[PDB]
Amino acid sequence: VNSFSGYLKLTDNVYIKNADIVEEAKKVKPTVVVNAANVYLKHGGGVAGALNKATNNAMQVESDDYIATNGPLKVGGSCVLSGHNLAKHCLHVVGPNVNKGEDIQLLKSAYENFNQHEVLLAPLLSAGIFGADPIHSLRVCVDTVRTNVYLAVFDKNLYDKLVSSFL
């Protein structure tokens, strides 16, 4: 039993809700919140910009030190950093950005990072401003993640579309 509330159950381990991931994280304070990161951990817009803003830019400061030490992530890769005031940990995961020409096949690799954590709050990877089809992202999530994932979909219209089309 966990403290996530109001989610629709899609499969044994995948759940979905129309919600602002920032407000969800502030309420639940999960062990792991997933950020829709880029390889430079530059949290400018979309989920990343919103999460970072909610940390008063502390996420960006921590991320800049991470990059200065380790260099960029790989597309499909991840790193674990602090969750600041939002969660215990933030799993920064880089899905392919279609608006950059990156290989959508890497979306499965991106979701594989979730399997290293028993429970996560997360967005749909490569959706939104990353330019991939969210219906496809949800399908890859369900077919790749085996741990317990609570998906927050900001757009109510898209949420209704994802549920009604879910196979």
Site for Cl ion, rule CB under 5 A: 46, 128-129
State which residue, 98 or 119, has the beta carbon closest to Cl ion: 98
Closest approach of Cl ion to the CB of residue 31, in Å: 23
As given in the structure block, the two tokens for residue 42 are 């530059």
Cβ–Cβ under 8 Å, residues 32 and 90:
yes
CA 131 remoteness from chain centre: 14
Query: What separation, in Å, do the N-terminal and C-terminal C-alpha atoms of the chain show?
Result: 26
Partner interacting with residue 155 (select from Cl ion, ligand A1A8D, none; CB below 5-8 Å by kind): ligand A1A8D
Residue 91 is classified by DSSP as E
Closest approach of Cl ion to the CB of residue 3, in Å: 25
Question: Which spans of this chain sit near ligand A1A8D (rule: CB under 6 A)?
Answer: 20-22, 36, 46-47, 50, 123-124, 127-128, 152-155, 158
